[PDB]
């Protein structure tokens, strides 16, 4: 596997997935254990909690990453506030590609949930979300989306040209230019038989943004009814 040096730099910033899955699983199981039968978290609450924990992991990943760590705090804030949901979605979708299987949903805890259940025990807005998500997963599986391509898309999502009032906008332009070039070099050399892999991967970014927005609206509605676990990171990003 020929890998551009820049991508090797991006990879050194990646955490151990199986480890992260277990740590979050362990913590959730620990909290439910400390609470009474009269304060047990609902499945929805538990899912929100794991999303919050995943967000923390995402913020730590970014905070320690090359390039991003060079930005002033206020710039880091602006970038993360713009893409937090996109990263959560990209994180979820990649997990489906690597650990999931057709017909089921693989959670960050390592738990798997059949789609049939969701289609009969969930509302229209959520099923619509899962459907689109499922479409995206099917496309990445088809392309044999891999870790090198995954980290490139993460940086392209993080360093968004759409973010305004950034002090160091040049760094965003640089990441966009160089990571796009690195991704193209990578796909051309390792998946030559897929002449359009680079382009097909980029076409997924707008779809990821679209799904993230739909996901936010969904959570926002729950938020208004005060049903989402609060006093956490998930809620602050949503309430913003």
């Amino acid at each position: 596997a020929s890998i551009p040096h820049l991508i090797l730099e991006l990879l050194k910033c990646e955490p151990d997935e199986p480890q992260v899955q277990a740590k979050i699983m362990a913590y959730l199981q620990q909290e439910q254990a400390n609470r009474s039968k009269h304060e047990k978290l609902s499945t929805f609450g538990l899912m929100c909690k794991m999303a919050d924990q995943t967000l923390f992991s995402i913020v730590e990943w970014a905070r320690s990453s090359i390039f991003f760590r060079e930005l002033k705090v206020d710039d880091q804030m602006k970038l993360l506030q713009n893409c937090w949901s996109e990263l959560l979605i990209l994180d979820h979708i990649y997990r489906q590609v690597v650990h999931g299987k057709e017909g089921s949903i693989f959670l960050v805890t390592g738990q798997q949930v059949d789609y049939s259940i969701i289609a009969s025990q969930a509302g229209a807005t959520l099923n619509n979300l899962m459907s689109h998500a499922q479409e995206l997963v099917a496309k990445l599986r088809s392309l044999q989306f891999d870790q090198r391509e995954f980290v490139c898309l993460k940086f392209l999502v993080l360093f968004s040209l759409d973010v305004k009032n950034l002090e160091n906008f040049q760094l965003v332009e640089g990441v966009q230019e160089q990571v796009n070039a690195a991704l193209l070099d990578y796909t051309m050399c390792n998946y030559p038989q897929q002449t359009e892999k680079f382009g097909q991967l980029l076409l997924r970014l707008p779809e990821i943004r679209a799904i993230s927005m739909q996901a936010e609206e969904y959570l926002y509605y729950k938020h208004l009814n005060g049903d989402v676990p609060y006093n956490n990171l998930l809620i602050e990003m949503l309430h913003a």
Partner: peptide, 14 residues
Amino acid sequence: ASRPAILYALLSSS
């Protein structure tokens, strides 16, 4: 202001 306190606290840590 209305900025995410937890996020800000995390990014502000060395």
